[PDB]
């Protein structure tokens, strides 16, 4: 269900125009595209854009991630398999250990490594937050693209596109409802569309309407604000256990039984954006909107 070209990519206007300028120019001159850093919460299309970059350049893409490359030998094998103009896609690039990291940095300064010459290539890194990378490495990317949450309108377009490919009809009103509950994320909108499609199948309807969407949301436990089970657990934990905050990230993560990253990089971004949560020097706090939405008496 992923697009194959920038022209097929819906949303992320700021990112597309910047990337398109560099991409088209590099192609016209037959030059190797400058290194690109994609940053933003999960499900926004960073991986999708990385593949588009290689396809537009008509080169090969090599997918990997920091957590995987633990020993220099692993990084070496990849770099040496790169053909001129190829794209080296490193997801979770900020998770590269000193060893492999130093090796990669070296290959991008003169395309050559020692425990071996490397073919000119384009490093495309992806991270949940650009600030997570070390000062040195980040200074190597000539193109930094910060993805933002999609607007309801863009999500609706994505939802309509997804439905079309799944051989299912959907009413604008229904598409709008799903978009409003997609937490600004394209991946979520598409997955909710697949689930709503299942409801259409079971109820034997001719097209997706608001009724069908509502029924699906009830089954998936997604509220009118698009919040899921865990989103509500985060807010309720702060409200009940920490009296609304402030509560530190490490303390909140331990109470929830999840890694700190899952909160700050995966769930918190939308909660902050939508005004359910706020960050202070002393820690996270819930807003009046969170109390109201979850029906907790405003203290
Ligand atoms: N025409 C399109 N069809 C499908 N998805 C599209 C389209 N145009 C843009 N997108 C975006 O591409 C993403 C596709 O979802 P997917 O789960 O593949 O994301 P991703 O690239 O893995 O995310 P990330 O790497 O940022 O975590 C969505 O964020 C979606 O909005
Ligand atoms: Co802290």
In words, what does this structure look like?
The protein is globular and about 65 Å long. It folds into three domains: 1-150, P-loop containing nucleotide triphosphate hydrolases (Rossmann fold, 3-Layer(aba) Sandwich); 226-298, Winged helix-like DNA-binding domain superfamily/Winged helix DNA-binding domain (Arc Repressor Mutant, subunit A, Orthogonal Bundle), CATH 1.10.10.10; 151-225, Helicase, Ruva Protein, domain 3. The protein is of the alpha/beta class and 299 residues long. It has helices at 13-28, 46-57, 72-81, 98-110, 135-138, 152-165, 172-180, 186-203, 210-220, 229-241, 249-256, 260-273, 288-293, and strands at 36-39, 61-65, 87-91, 122-127, 143-146, 277-280, 283-286. A five-stranded parallel beta sheet has the order 2-3-4-1-5, covered by helices on one side. Strands 6-7 form a two-stranded antiparallel ribbon. Helix content is 49%, strand content 11%. The structure holds adenosine-5'-triphosphate and cobalt (II) ion.
In short:
With 299 residues, the chain is α/β, with parallel strands linked by helices. 49% of the residues lie in helices and 11% in strands.
SSE topology sketch:
Blueprint: H1 13-28, E1 36-39, H2 46-57, E2 61-65, H3 72-81, E3 87-91, H4 98-110, E4 122-127, H5 135-138, E5 143-146, H6 152-165, H7 172-180, H8 186-203, H9 210-220, H10 229-241, H11 249-256, H12 260-273, E6 277-280, E7 283-286, H13 288-293
Parallel strand pairs: 1-4, 1-5, 2-3, 3-4
Antiparallel strand pairs: 6-7
Bound molecules: adenosine-5'-triphosphate (ATP) and cobalt (II) ion.
PDB class: dna binding protein
Keywords: AAA+-Class ATPase, Winged-Helix Domain, DNA Translocase, Holliday Junction, Branch Migration, Walker A, Walker B, Sensor 1, Sensor 2, Arginine Finger, DNA binding protein
Assembly: monomeric
